[PDB]
Amino acid sequence: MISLIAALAVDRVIGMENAMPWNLPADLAWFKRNTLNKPVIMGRHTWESIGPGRKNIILSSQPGTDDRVTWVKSVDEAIAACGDVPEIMVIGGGRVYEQFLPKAQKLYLTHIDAEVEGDTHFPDYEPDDWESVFSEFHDADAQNSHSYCFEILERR
Amino acid sequence: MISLIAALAVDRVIGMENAMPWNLPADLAWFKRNTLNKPVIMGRHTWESIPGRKNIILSSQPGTDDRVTWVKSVDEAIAACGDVPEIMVIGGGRVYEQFLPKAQKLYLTHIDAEVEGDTHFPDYEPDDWESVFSEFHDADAQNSHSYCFEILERR
Ligand SMILES: NC(=O)c1ccc[n+]([C@@H]2O[C@H](COP(=O)([O-])OP(=O)(O)OC[C@H]3O[C@@H](n4cnc5c(N)ncnc54)[C@H](OP(=O)(O)O)[C@@H]3O)[C@@H](O)[C@H]2O)c1
Numbered sequence: 001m002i003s004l005i006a007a008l009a010v011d012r013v014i015g016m017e018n019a020m021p022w023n024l025p026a027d028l029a030w031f032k033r034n035t036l037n038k039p040v041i042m043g044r045h046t047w048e049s050i051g052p053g054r055k056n057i058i059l060s061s062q063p064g065t066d067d068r069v070t071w072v073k074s075v076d077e078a079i080a081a082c083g084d085v086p087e088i089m090v091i092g093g094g095r096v097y098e099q100f101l102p103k104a105q106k107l108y109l110t111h112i113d114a115e116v117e118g119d120t121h122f123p124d125y126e127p128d129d130w131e132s133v134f135s136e137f138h139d140a141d142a143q144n145s146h147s148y149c150f151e152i153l154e155r156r
Numbered sequence: 157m158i159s160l161i162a163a164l165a166v167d168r169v170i171g172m173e174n175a176m177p178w179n180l181p182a183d184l185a186w187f188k189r190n191t192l193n194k195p196v197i198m199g200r201h202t203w204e205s206i207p208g209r210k211n212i213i214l215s216s217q218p219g220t221d222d223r224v225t226w227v228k229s230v231d232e233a234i235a236a237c238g239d240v241p242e243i244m245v246i247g248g249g250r251v252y253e254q255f256l257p258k259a260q261k262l263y264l265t266h267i268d269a270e271v272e273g274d275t276h277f278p279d280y281e282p283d284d285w286e287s288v289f290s291e292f293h294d295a296d297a298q299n300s301h302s303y304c305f306e307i308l309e310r311r
């Protein structure tokens with residue numbers, strides 16, 4: 001199966017011109033929990049932002065620039081590179097989420113109570129086509145700059 | 157001599173109820189550049205938020221980590237640093253307020269972020285401080301806000 005994992009500010013904003021204006025180690029821990037050694041697919045801009053671990057599959061139209069990870073030139077090649085696994089984790093960014101949302105069976109979302117003027121958004125999903133199977137709200141604290149809610153949705 | 161090092165949002169905000177809403181690895185690298193192995197003094201809340209050098213923690217209560225040095229007063233904090241060229245006071249608000257009158261140098265990162273804080277860097281009169289270094293940086297893929305490193309020396 002294919003899953004998407006993303007952290008959304010209000011209006012489904014996921015990315016800005018620069019690094020996101022928050023500090024959420026709990027979200028980093030949740031991201032790790034839910035990826036572990038599973039194959040990940042990401043776009044080239046997300047790869048440049050995160051600086052590797054599992055299979056790391058990077059989408060780019062151009063030849064790859066780091067032989068430690070696997071570079072692919074299409075969605076189909078990305079899926080093929082992950083092989084026959086229980087769950088593929090699509091980790092961003094906006095252009096990649098848009099292409100994989102119709103293929104996805106599960107969303108792992110972190111809803112962050114932050115308003116940020118973004119340039120990239122998580123794709124529109126119709127909540128009626130998705131069953132919320134898990135939800136956990138957390139307050140901001142000494143380590144986390146904003147309140148946040150982890151949610152898992154499974155396609156209906 | 158005593159120096160303060162701090163990261164200031166607008167209105168001299170240094171701290172909030174919760175973690176600061178920014179991601180500034182360049183400021184962490186600057187903080188390291190300017191501390192390295194020099195003794196550091198910090199308040200107990202800053203200790204809990206963040207050991208390496210001498211790490212001197214102010215608290216009214218017995219210490220809870222024997223890997224660092226705990227002191228109950230400003231004068232003991234200074235004494236615990238020994239005879240060194242530069243003591244780095246790293247926060248927080250209560251600690252900066254007590255050490256500012258003793259300080260000869262400020263290492264400030266001015267961050268272009270507006271945040272409603274609960275704690276501020278102490279008032280200083282810029283006329284009483286000479287800016288000896290200033291370096292501006294844009295936000296980028298790793299740093300959420302633009303920032304300016306500044307070093308002031310007491311005139
Ligand atoms: N998303 C884009 O295509 C694109 C283009 C120009 C500027 N930007 C800016 O970059 C920032 C991040 O955007 P984002 O979150 O959308 O980035 P992202 O998903 O992390 O990465 C997008 C990149 O992934 C590669 N890619 C995605 N789908 C592909 C496919 N089917 N075949 C081959 N390569 C594919 C392209 O790399 P290559 O560029 O190496 O081909 C693309 O530019 C935004 O501010 C956006 O405006 C994005």
Ligand SMILES: NC(=O)c1ccc[n+]([C@@H]2O[C@H](COP(=O)([O-])OP(=O)(O)OC[C@H]3O[C@@H](n4cnc5c(N)ncnc54)[C@H](OP(=O)(O)O)[C@@H]3O)[C@@H](O)[C@H]2O)c1
Pocket residue numbers: 142171198199200201202203204205214215216217227228229230247248249250251252254274275
């Ligand atoms: N981050 C956290 O852990 C946390 C938790 C609760 C509240 N706060 C609140 O957050 C706000 C900002 O704190 P801040 O930046 O001012 O904290 P800070 O300077 O990092 O730490 C202040 C602490 O340092 C100790 N201290 C400072 N001067 C001292 C002296 N002369 N003698 C003995 N002990 C001394 C006291 O510890 P003791 O308290 O151990 O005596 C004091 O509470 C404050 O309103 C604070 O009360 C922060």
